[PDB]
Amino acid sequence: GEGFFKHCVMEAETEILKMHFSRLTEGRQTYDWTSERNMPAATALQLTVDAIKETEGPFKGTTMLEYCNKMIEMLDWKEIKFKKVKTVV
């Protein structure tokens, strides 16, 4: 072809733009950085988002795009808040 890439990308764009970010929980184990441990993707994403919520207010993106936009927004954040467990005797 001559538009091989253009079209393949089209298909990609379509599927992704549709996608609800909850489907991101589907997959292998990934690194939760809140507790700095490995987790099943679902629980790790739960913490990630929950943290975003407690830092700056609940997430209303409902899409992979707005998720990604928030991701890039957090790099500029000077301060971030976590759900971290500290036991006291």
């Binding site: 072809g1 609800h20 909850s22 929980t25 679902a42 629980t43 739960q46 609940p58 209303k60 409902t62």
Partner: protein, 762 residues
């Protein structure tokens, strides 16, 4: 009663917890789909081990307390503990053995019938196995490695989205979106399924999950051995593999397999209709499609929803789909042959040569599919570069060879000129010049010597040793004494490629689809079958096929006026029935249209008994809403005390008895539809027929959405039947959103409204 209460109290408790409260308020309901996904049940690292570990302990399993309390003793017969009060979840723990005990001694009766038709899928896949014979032998089999062929086939198979709609409607009403497209058109299956499954509230989730499978042919990529019928697929493993074989199988098949072929013939004729008139091919075929109604073995279904959503893609079927918005790519049709493209590309170029012609100059490698014969070809610069045949029967191999040579288009294509200019050249279809590939094609399809001619047009050589098995004879043998050039047979079949792709583009004015910006997939007219045989098939609207008499069109259209025009509002049948006033009904202007067609001799004597039945049914809970239509037209005339039986109503010498479905009037049982000879019509919105109990919630709808202003009382769906016409009311829809409606004129011109405007703009 407290079942609904304790839920409310729970909600109170949960919304008091601010943390849970805010997450419950913010956002759509769609969040549930995400929320559920934030819980895996448990760790899944070591499956078999975990289970072996699990059952090892005597009391691990989670179980249901309440029901067991109600029906049976919790204590044991051999004095080994079975029950405790110790717990977080409401479900209390118990031993494994108890389950076996209730199976043994539990008190229960009469569940047998309930079961099977829930899993008619599985149970049927059993039933089929009973009816077959057996035989045993061995061979070095050459199986057909890759066919994307339907397995586990079931009647009325459908797409995933639509089946989801069914799933919703049948399982429950309380939370279901009022989904139009599937329900209006495919109603009847809705009736059946909803009827058998809604009444006896059991296994609400499970049944749904298994119905999803019940209409889903698992079209996997599998190795077969010639038996390509979707029925032998289910149990291929027992039938064969590379060294196994079994016998006496073709016989027992579901009624689907032949029904699909019937639809192919349907599409054949429907396409011949558009072929007949070349004033337009686009605006006419679409009409023949949407008009035509199919009758499945147990259901009436539209032709549109069958075509758009059929699995098998035949040359005809391609054309049929092309009219609609149905993407079914990866398919290439040329005459009777089927092809797939696997390599390279090139542009369509024009080349006049002495016998204008379209030739392709691509180094393209494609796959050849013909009856009982498969092959691989590659063309470069309008001539076949590489060729290999994996066919079974010699003849079919030769056919392959030929057809593919045609598509190939060498210089020898031009050399052979017996006739053509006389007949094949110009096609007698409003003076339309038929395309040239298809011309020589038809020339070869004509006679036996025409095959021999171009078969000889290829270079012939005495093949070398080492090509003894590979070489192809003119007659189609493997002798290799004399053989064709640029061709070698393969001892065995040839694999078929597959691509998960969807492509669609409009069609040209001569039944040509230049899909994917070219590619000539449409093949014009595949097969010139001039035959007109049909069984239990409906057609409509100046079909150009004469099945419509003058007297029968008078009767039928006369009925259609009444049936069709009545439903919208006041002074139409529904409102009249609700008022219990049957006079206005008699005096209806659409009945007057029907008056003059009745037999004059007994006109009053008929009207007598007619006016009787209609009046007797006026009391509610006794009227048959079908019968009323059948009886009404005769009532118009003044009722004379005939005292002579009026069972046979001569409407221009043809009778219409009460009940007793006949030629003129078919009173179908258990679903809303009625046949008038070779034609069918039905009205959906106001049928409360006594028999339509299960879908008196579904069927009553002719409503639509307006505005949300009136604080219309939140009525339940069952309460919707009572609110009369022109009444704006409020209702809960689907899984959250609440909207408002009134008794409406149904949605109209879904397609045409746009289509005509689009035609006007040009």
């Amino acid at each position: 009663m407290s079942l609904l209460l304790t839920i409310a109290k729970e909600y109170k408790r949960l919304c008091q917890d601010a943390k849970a409260a805010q997450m419950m308020t913010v956002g759509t309901v769609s969040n549930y789909t995400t929320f559920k996904k934030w819980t895996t049940s448990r760790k899944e690292k070591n499956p078999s081990l975990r289970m072996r570990w699990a059952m090892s302990s005597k009391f691990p399993i989670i179980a249901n307390k309440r029901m067991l309390e109600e029906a049976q003793i919790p204590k044991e017969h051999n004095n080994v503990a079975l029950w405790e009060d110790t717990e977080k979840r409401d479900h209390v723990l118990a031993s494994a053995s108890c389950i076996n005990y209730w199976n043994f001694c539990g008190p229960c009766v009469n569940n047998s019938e309930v079961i099977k038709e829930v899993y008619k899928s599985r149970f049927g896949r059993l039933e089929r196995r009973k009816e077959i014979m057996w035989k045993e032998l061995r061979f070095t089999l050459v199986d057909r490695q890759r066919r994307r062929v339907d397995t586990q086939p079931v009647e009325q198979r459908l797409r995933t989205g639509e089946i989801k709609d069914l799933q919703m409607w049948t399982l429950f009403e309380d939370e279901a979106p009022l989904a139009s497209k599937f329900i209006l058109d495919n109603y009847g299956l809705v009736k059946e399924m909803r009827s058998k499954f809604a009444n006896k509230p059991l296994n609400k989730e499970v049944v749904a999950h298994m119905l999803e499978k019940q209409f889903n042919p698992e079209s996997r990529f599998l190795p077969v051995f010639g038996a390509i019928r979707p029925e032998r697929m289910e149990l291929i493993h027992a039938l064969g593999g590379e060294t196994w074989i079994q016998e006496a199988n073709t016989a027992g098949i579901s009624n689907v397999d032949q029904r699909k072929n019937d639809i192919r013939a349907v599409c054949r004729k429907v396409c011949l209709a558009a072929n007949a008139s070349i004033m337009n091919a686009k605006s006419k075929l679409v009409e023949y499609i949407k008009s035509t109604s199919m009758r499945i073995g147990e259901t009436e279904r539209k032709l549109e929803e069958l075509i758009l959503e059929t699995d098998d893609v035949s040359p005809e079927v391609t054309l049929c789909k092309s009219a609609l918005g149905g993407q079914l790519g990866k398919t290439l049709s040329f005459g009777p042959m089927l092809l797939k493209k696997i390599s390279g590309s090139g542009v369509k170029v024009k080349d006049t040569v002495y016998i204008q012609f379209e030739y392709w100059s691509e180094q393209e490698e494609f796959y050849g599919e013909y009856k009982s014969a498969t092959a691989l070809f590659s063309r470069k610069e309008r001539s076949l570069e590489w060729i290999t045949i994996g066919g079974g029967i010699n003849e079919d191999r030769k056919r392959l060879l030929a057809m593919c040579m045609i598509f190939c288009r060498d210089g020898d294509y031009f050399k052979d000129a017996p006739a053509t200019i006389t007949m094949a050249d110009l096609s007698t279809k409003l003076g339309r010049e038929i395309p040239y590939q298809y011309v020589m094609m038809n020339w070869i399809q004509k006679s036996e010597d025409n095959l021999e001619a171009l078969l000889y047009s290829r270079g012939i050589v005495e093949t070398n040793p080492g090509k003894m098995g590979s070489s192809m004879g003119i007659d189609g043998s493997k002798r290799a004494i004399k053989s064709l050039r640029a061709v070698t047979i393969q001892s065995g079949k040839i694999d078929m490629p597959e691509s998960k792709e969807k492509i669609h583009l409009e069609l040209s004015d001569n039944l040509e689809a230049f899909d994917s910006s070219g590619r000539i997939v449409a093949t014009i007219l595949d097969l010139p079958s001039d035959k007109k045989v049909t069984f239990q098939d409906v057609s409509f609207q100046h079909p150009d096929l004469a099945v419509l008499r003058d007297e029968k069109t008078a009767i039928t259209k006369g009925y259609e006026a009444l049936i069709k025009r009545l439903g919208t509002g006041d002074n139409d049948i529904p409102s009249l029935i609700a008022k219990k006033d049957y006079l206005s009904l008699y005096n209806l202007p659409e009945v007057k249209l029907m008056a003059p067609l009745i037999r004059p001799n007994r006109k009053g004597v008929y009207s007598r008994v007619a006016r009787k039945l209609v009046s007797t049914q006026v009391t509610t809970g006794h009227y048959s809403l079908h019968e009323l239509i059948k009886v009404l037209p005769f009532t118009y005339f003044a009722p004379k005390q005939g005292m002579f039986e009026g069972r046979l109503f001569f409407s221009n010498d043809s009778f219409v008895e009460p009940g007793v479905n006949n030629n003129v009037f078919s009173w179908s049982k258990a679903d809303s539809s009625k046949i008038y000879c070779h034609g069918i019509a039905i009205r959906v919105p106001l049928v409360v027929g006594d028999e339509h109990m299960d879908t008196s919630l579904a069927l009553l709808e002719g409503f639509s959405v307006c505005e949300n202003d009136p604080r219309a009382p939140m009525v339940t769906r069952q309460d919707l039947i009572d609110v009369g016409f022109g009444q704006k009311v409020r209702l809960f829809v689907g899984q959250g959103s609440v909207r408002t409606f009134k008794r409406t004129a149904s949605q109209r011109a879904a397609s045409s409204d746009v289509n005509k405007n689009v035609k006007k703009i040009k």
